[PDB]
Amino acid sequence: MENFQKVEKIGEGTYGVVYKARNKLTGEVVALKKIRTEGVPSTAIREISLLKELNHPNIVKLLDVIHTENKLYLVFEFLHQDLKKFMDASALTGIPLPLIKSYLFQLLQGLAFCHSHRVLHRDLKPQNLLINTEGAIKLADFGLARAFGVPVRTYTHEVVTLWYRAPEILLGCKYYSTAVDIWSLGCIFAEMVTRRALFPGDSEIDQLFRIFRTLGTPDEVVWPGVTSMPDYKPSFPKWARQDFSKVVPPLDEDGRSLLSQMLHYDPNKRISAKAALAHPFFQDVTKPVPHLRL
């Protein structure tokens, strides 16, 4: 690195290798993402550069976009743990409801902010939600999907997780809306509560059918226009909807109500981040300190 001192490899992200690094001049510790083929689209750099201005307490700050030696590096503020690791670590006892509520509330504030600035995430998952010792949680990688492209494989043949994909994406809709992020966050909310992924599909069709088996196969009544979707097939099995009381026990009715609104099939009926923040579930929200072992 021209000015960076690699501390350690954080992993192989969706867009490339990520390292925890220290700025030799500022002393600042950051996450450095090396972006993967041969050229680096100027449209991408302009788009990414715009995200440097998207600053909010619940959004991982994009510090710099470095385009040198015809290579692209993304410098992000560093956080010590991600929600996937935290959930695994909390698997035995479960994350306390007050902390689940604090995290959901903060994530919705982050989404409300991004969506108000016309920025979508499109690939929210526990691994992209970062936490610190102060009880904060932040969304990482907002806007990169649009600035770049389809995931599929990180850069070293790595199975793309479909568990948090909204149904309209799975049915081949070409235009994503802010609703896709609310769907993903609803899936994450459920997983924090039950300690098990809500829809752990291992293929696009298994993902879609797992959603259908739980929420019922969508029809024109609950989702106008669904039968005209690109990948909709009249041959899809018709499953009956299950009761939320069975899906996310023992979450209370306020929680079930909010989750149900975050998981509506019709993206237009799905609750917005702004509206969700006003839901009765957050009446008693607080900001607890998590037990973080680093």
- The binding site for ATP consists of 10-18, 33, 77-79, 82, 125-128, 141
Is residue 79 part of the contact set for ligand X85 (CB under 6 A)? Answer: yes
Is residue 81 part of the contact set for ligand X85 (CB under 6 A)? Answer: yes
Dist CA 196 CA 280 (whole Å): 25
Residue owning tokens 């696009």? 204
Dist CA 214 CA 243 (whole Å): 8
Number of residues that bind ligand X85 (CB under 6 A): 19
Q: Please identify which residue in 82, 123, 181, 191 interacts with ligand X85, judged by CB under 6 A.
A: 82
DSSP H stretches of helix in the chain: 42-51, 83-89, 97-116, 144-147, 167-170, 179-194, 204-215, 244-247, 253-262, 273-277
Q: In what order do the strands lie in the sheet with 137-139?
A: 81-82, 129-131, 137-139
Q: Which two tokens stand for residue 200?
A: 């752990």
Among residue numbers 3 through 32, which ones bind ligand X85 (CB under 6 A)?
Answer: 10-11, 13, 18, 20, 31
Among candidate residues 64, 88, 123, 181, the one labeled active-site is 123
64 in active site: no
Is residue 89 part of the contact set for ligand X85 (CB under 6 A)? Answer: no
Comparing CA positions, the residue from 32, 40, 26, 43 lying closest to residue 10 is 32
Q: Which of 127/257 has CB closer to ligand X85?
A: 127
Q: Please identify which residue in 47, 52, 64, 127 interacts with ligand X85, judged by CB under 6 A.
A: 127
Q: Which of 158/254 has CB closer to ligand X85?
A: 158
In terms of Cβ atoms closer than 10 Å to its own Cβ (0-12, 13-18, 19+), residue 194 is middle
Q: Please identify which residue in 130, 139, 147, 190 interacts with ligand X85, judged by CB under 6 A.
A: 130
Active site residues: 123
Binding footprint of ligand X85 on the chain (CB under 6 A): 10-11, 13, 18, 20, 31, 33, 60, 76, 78-82, 84-85, 127, 130, 140
